[PDB]
Ligand binder design. Structure first.
Ligand SMILES: [Cl-]
Ligand SMILES: [Cl-]
Length: 164
């Protein structure tokens, strides 16, 4: 198991524009197009992202390419963030992947907001961090996914993804 495989399980893959859990226009493997309520604006962002007139549909290869870009950007966002970098450096490879998943889902800014959890993770206080992470809108809105990421932080293994 790895970050790519994990996120592919968590986000799924859809080749036509769809609405995510928050009602935002998205495509591929969790690639957010826009927070605007307009499908046209979404179609526009889509064409600009792929480089062609898509008409709201992309191929598997296109989805994968967006996905690669997106993972790369999450990593870079982490490394550039003063609050995130140190946590990330302190963690093992498996837990680093959980942090990347969170950033991919919610953005660098969102994650950097989990101040107390981050401190706990940095201190390697696993059970405590898990409890704290759960007291969030994030866990209440997408509990099954949140539980998978949280277990990953807690145990440092990919067990929550083994079966799926
Ligand atoms: Cl893009
Ligand atoms: Cl969920």
């Amino acid at each position: 198991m790895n970050i790519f495989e994990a996120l592919r399980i968590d986000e799924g893959l859809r080749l036509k524009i769809y609405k995510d859990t928050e009602g935002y226009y998205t495509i591929g493997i969790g690639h957010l197009l826009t927070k605007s309520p307009s499908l046209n604006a979404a179609k526009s962002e889509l064409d600009k992202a792929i480089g062609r007139n898509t008409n709201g549909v992309i191929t598997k290869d296109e989805a994968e390419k967006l996905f690669n870009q997106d993972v790369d950007a999450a990593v870079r966002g982490i490394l550039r963030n003063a609050k995130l970098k140190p946590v990330y450096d302190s963690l093992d490879a498996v837990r680093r992947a959980a942090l990347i998943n969170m950033v991919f889902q919610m953005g660098e800014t969102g994650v950097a907001g989990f101040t107390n959890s981050l401190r706990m993770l940095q201190q390697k206080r696993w059970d405590e961090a898990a409890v704290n992470l759960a007291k969030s809108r994030w866990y209440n809105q997408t509990p099954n996914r949140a539980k998978r990421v949280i277990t990953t932080f807690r145990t440092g293994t990919w067990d929550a993804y083994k079966n799926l």
